[PDB]
PDB file of N, CA and C in Angstrom:
ATOM      1  N   UNK A1022     105.750  91.787 104.081  1.00  0.00           N
ATOM      2  CA  UNK A1022     104.438  91.452 104.889  1.00  0.00           C
ATOM      3  C   UNK A1022     103.747  92.207 105.474  1.00  0.00           C
ATOM      4  N   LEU A1023     102.875  91.541 106.793  1.00  0.00           N
ATOM      5  CA  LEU A1023     102.163  92.157 107.534  1.00  0.00           C
ATOM      6  C   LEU A1023     103.177  93.504 108.235  1.00  0.00           C
ATOM      7  N   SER A1024     104.464  93.435 108.209  1.00  0.00           N
ATOM      8  CA  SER A1024     105.617  94.318 108.713  1.00  0.00           C
ATOM      9  C   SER A1024     106.040  94.964 107.241  1.00  0.00           C
ATOM     10  N   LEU A1025     106.549  94.179 106.251  1.00  0.00           N
ATOM     11  CA  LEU A1025     106.874  94.965 105.206  1.00  0.00           C
ATOM     12  C   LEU A1025     105.892  95.352 104.354  1.00  0.00           C
ATOM     13  N   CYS A1026     104.724  94.396 104.032  1.00  0.00           N
ATOM     14  CA  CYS A1026     103.853  94.813 103.314  1.00  0.00           C
ATOM     15  C   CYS A1026     102.937  95.956 103.936  1.00  0.00           C
ATOM     16  N   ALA A1027     103.558  97.137 104.512  1.00  0.00           N
ATOM     17  CA  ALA A1027     102.958  97.989 105.166  1.00  0.00           C
ATOM     18  C   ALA A1027     102.418  98.926 104.232  1.00  0.00           C
TER      19      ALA A1027
END
């Protein structure tokens, strides 16, 4: 996500 979906 915002962190992994980087």
